[PDB]
Design a protein around this ligand. Structure first.
Ligand SMILES: CCCCCCCCCCCCC/C=C/[C@H](O)[C@H](N)CO
Lengths: 175, 249, 240, 249, 249
């Protein structure tokens, strides 16, 4: 999927409920590969320091007849990354009813020991974990696609700021 | 959108029209300074999901028993002699427009359940407090005839509401109906209900949650999950000492 | 639930002014002080003024569709001997003449054009601090165009294939002239080679219509790409 | 219900929060009296419908190129040296409640597209200006190796947004999502965006429209049409002379 | 008589003349609602008693590491990403009027200790965080020569104050002397000292407690116990998630 349009689509299906995650990624907006090449990541890679809250929106692109509930969780760092919904539900989280609203926004509030995090993978300024789980399950009637896609979007909130302009690693020139 | 602590959920019944509240100074029995963990414990915890099938008879949980292993709420519960909490119970069950079925979700104060033996009141603590997994109602009553190793478990019959009363009258309790054609969730706000301002959480379950299939699940072809998300509310704890470690199994 | 935080962080260093408030190398112009008859030494060099010879400033600028700014040019001049067996040299003086579009381009290192009666010229003495000049916004349009989705000519029916053909995305909106660089000194017995590094700093910057940044290596002055079309690495869907 | 001239259409995005407007006297470069055909040209024109399939990679059009053959707007465009117009773009794509899929509709100022050859900026005018039929994005980049008769065409790769930028970031442009489960149309109001108050419409395309399948079309069994209806807005024309007749094919 | 929560203790030094305090709104970095367990965690916990002998070189503990297993304080510490607390440290050491000896009790912010190997900064997490048992100073430095299985432990020399500084100057730190002829206890009130308003309690030890025999214990004939009782103060916690379970041994 990488370096194709498929890399933007995360597949849900109508299988029986499980507690295993749908998707997982770390809150390193400048260095986590899923976030580094987003517009936010691109901007952050010109700066050394970043702080502020983030917005993660998820758009459900299944049929109108599909129903389901999902759990979207942010776990601040320092503990084992949530392996299942039982751990993930202990952190910050939102329950998303795809039948009601095709889009769900979870705000990852700024929580950090330091006043700024580095824009590199750094243990001391690690930002935590983001995971998605099935809350109940995706349910479809007959004559309906049993597999659909969700899309993820990330942006910075109004409290976001960056510091220490620097050159990015995302462009290079040979010879 | 209902938010408690770090948890958010996105039809609603306040049991007895009484929102959960803290103990008033005029009703406080204990004299020591109460512990009020607030957001750290007053937050939504999601129980293990159960499966609604055509043959399902029903499910039951006890509060605060179902939350005894829920992070800091469980820690505060087992570290204190006395505990008090209301609850927000959010039952989640979605299906298609082509599914049918209805669930009655009842919050029952002092939800005592019938035993399985000729010996009265013989259900042992381990079985009476199953934790988050809860228990299930049965279609009929089966007397436990094992004399050597009695099961000493509940035998809650569905149409007797597990306690020798007709299930149809359980609507006198605070309740909500999840009718698959109309809604996919039920929200019950339960104040702390007891004959005391505060009690032992480990000894005593203030609330029972009973989910009965009023109309059996059906689909033209089926099983759908039911997920309980419960937030303790207005938590107060008193009597700090070494942690209680209840006997299990 | 959230607490009350009296936020103090500002966005001072992320203003478009601050984001571009740096001198960026846009060109390395090589010239030689040597005998005219060597035929291998370039006694003068002409560089068309552009930000597209390098990538860093180009990518930063191309975050946006339109820009309007004054420019600061800083010239860092380095020189070295090319051999050790032909004596030494006296301190070199360099002429950097701005040739606006239409002005005669020098053909020889010492032709008439270097009189620079109307062209601005900077004479830089070697060892002096890097030369510096400023220019205002000189676009013939109301803003510079980082992307031009069009042609300079529209081919017309009845014209042969050779006629009416112009490069896609090429317009005189970015025709800013050239810099002609020479060493004013007459040659020493030994060859000397110099490089003038041109650093560009936009000032008083205004930008319009933001764009996604370049994600694959640049290929030519346009938006073309040929290589490095797989920038994303591999990562598991459920791997933190 | 949006009406322009004799045309009516019965979710909406104003690009950069700027409604299309006429040139102010303080921004007018040309001095001759402008031509303002108003309703005769400022009206909705419906382009040829395209087909969205499971395998579709995307579509692109250029404005004003896509409207160059649209009645009096096209006549005024080719009769004048200078032209200026905003647009109302209405993408129409309906499906059943049992279909799924999502389209990203992006309006891109100065939507330059990558070529198909090692020669830089080599896409010829005829291919860069396809007219109402527009063009399609490709899954991958195919270098054109024909030296005798080079195609000299765009090779816009979908995930590179046809210009060497990640498609996921194209949302920085004014955009709308058509999610089949939610909506069947997208309306984008584009002001005239350029570095000049007015420019040559035949030389220069001010806007590009890119429609990418963000979620592939699917149906339980499929193809559904997509129809573009574009109205030029606040049209102004200057520099009347004999009609321009661009070379074609 | 000093009372905190349910705990009471019946000469006193406030480190830097700054009483422990909660984060001001103007200094709060995290935005989530903090957890303030108050009495349930802000109470005196008594560590395991150590034995002062004629040959004792000294003892050291790290805070909050020494309290990581102290009931609800430990639970809140391991359940939260961020934690902040001051402390009240009460060192208790009584003897007869016929005993002699003196202890220097020092509270050291960022009490970094020297390692035992030629590899710099090589002390592993398990040894750097011994918990309530703490560690002991040594008379001399012994380089650890085991290459296969390096101890990777501190080697804190007493006269170097465990960090390469003369012990006699450790009085620049907040301190109290327990002179057996004068007093039998020392009370140090430590505010939260750090370069941040709040930090990770598991990663970072804000305070070190070093108890050195300034005058060796003597008795005309001997060992006497030393007991540490530490109450965390003005506790705040942020960033609730699943419990941290640090690797041990
Ligand atoms: C003493 C003569 C040398 C100093 C004069 C240098 C002349 C500079 C005039 C040309 C101005 C170029 C400004 C920058 C060009 C960039 O392509 C555009 N700004 C792109 O946005």
């Amino acid at each position: 999927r990488k370096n194709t349009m498929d890399m933007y689509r995360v597949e849900l299906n109508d299988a029986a409920h499980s507690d295993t995650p749908i998707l997982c990624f770390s809150l390193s907006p400048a260095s986590d590969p899923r976030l580094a090449h987003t517009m936010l990541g691109e901007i952050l890679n010109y700066y050394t320091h970043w702080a502020g809250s983030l917005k993660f929106t998820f758009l459900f692109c299944g049929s109108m007849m599909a129903t389901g509930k999902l759990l979207v969780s942010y776990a601040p760092p320092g503990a084992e990354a949530p392996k299942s919904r039982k751990e993930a539900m202990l952190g910050t989280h939102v329950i998303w009813d795809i039948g009601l609203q095709s889009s769900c926004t979870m705000v990852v509030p700024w929580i950090s020991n330091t006043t700024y995090r580095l824009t590199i993978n750094d243990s001391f300024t690690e930002g935590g974990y983001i995971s998605m789980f099935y809350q109940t399950r995706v349910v479809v009637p007959l004559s309906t696609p049993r597999k659909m896609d969700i899309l993820g979007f990330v942006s910075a909130c109004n409290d976001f700021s960056v510091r220490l302009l620097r050159d990015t690693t995302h462009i290079s020139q040979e010879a | 959108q209902l938010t408690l602590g770090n948890s958010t959920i996105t039809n609603s019944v306040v049991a007895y029209g009484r929102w959960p509240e803290y103990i008033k100074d005029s009703e406080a029995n204990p004299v020591d300074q109460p512990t009020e963990p607030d957001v750290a414990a007053c937050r939504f915890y999601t129980l293990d999901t159960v499966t609604w099938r055509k043959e399902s008879r029903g499910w039951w949980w006890k509060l605060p028993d179902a939350l005894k292993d829920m992070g800091l709420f469980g820690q505060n519960m087992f570290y204190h002699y006395l505990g008090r909490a209301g609850y927000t119970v959010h039952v989640q069950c979605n299906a298609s427009k082509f599914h049918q079925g209805a669930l009655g979700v009842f919050a029952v104060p002092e939800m005592c359940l019938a035993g399985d033996s000729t010996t009265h009141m013989f259900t042992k603590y381990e079985n009476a407090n199953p934790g988050e997994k809860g228990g299930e109602f049965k279609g009929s009553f089966t007397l436990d005839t094992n004399a050597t190793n009695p099961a000493r478990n509940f035998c809650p019959v569905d149409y007797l509401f597990g306690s020798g009363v007709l299930a149809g009258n359980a609507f006198v309790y605070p309740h909500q109906i999840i009718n698959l054609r109309t809604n996919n969730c039920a929200t019950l706000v339960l104040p702390y209900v007891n004959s005391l301002s505060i009690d032992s959480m480990t000894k005593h379950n203030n609330w029972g949650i009973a989910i009965l299939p009023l109309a059996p699940l059906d689909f033209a072809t089926t099983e759908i999950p039911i997920t309980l998300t419960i937030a303790p509310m207005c938590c107060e704890f008193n009597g700090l000492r070494n942690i209680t470690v209840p006997r299990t199994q | 639930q959230t607490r009350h935080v009296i936020q103090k962080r500002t966005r001072s260093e992320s203003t478009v002014e601050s984001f571009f408030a740096r001198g960026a190398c846009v060109a390395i112009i090589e010239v030689d002080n040597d005998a005219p008859t060597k035929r291998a030494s370039k006694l003068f060099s002409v560089w068309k003024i552009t930000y597209k010879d390098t990538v860093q400033l180009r990518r930063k600028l191309e975050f946006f569709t339109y820009s309007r700014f004054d420019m600061e040019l800083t010239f860092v001049v380095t020189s070295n001997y090319t051999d050790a067996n032909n004596g030494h040299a006296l301190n070199q003086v360099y002429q950097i003449m701005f040739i606006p579009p239409g002005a005669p381009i020098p053909g020889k290192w010492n032709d008439y054009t270097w009189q620079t009666s109307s062209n601005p010229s900077v004479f830089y003495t070697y060892g002096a601090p890097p030369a510096r000049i400023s220019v205002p916004y000189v676009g013939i349009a109301n803003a510079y165009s980082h992307f031009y989705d069009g042609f300079a000519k529209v081919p017309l029916a009845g014209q042969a294939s050779t006629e009416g053909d112009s490069l896609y995305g090429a317009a005189s909106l970015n025709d800013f002239g050239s810099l002609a660089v020479r060493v004013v000194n007459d040659h020493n017995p030994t060859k000397l080679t110099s490089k003038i590094r041109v650093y560009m700093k936009p000032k008083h910057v205004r930008v319009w219509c933001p764009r996604p940044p370049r994600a694959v290596p640049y290929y030519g002055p346009g938006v073309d790409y040929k290589d490095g079309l797989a920038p994303l690495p591999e990562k598991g869907l459920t791997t933190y």
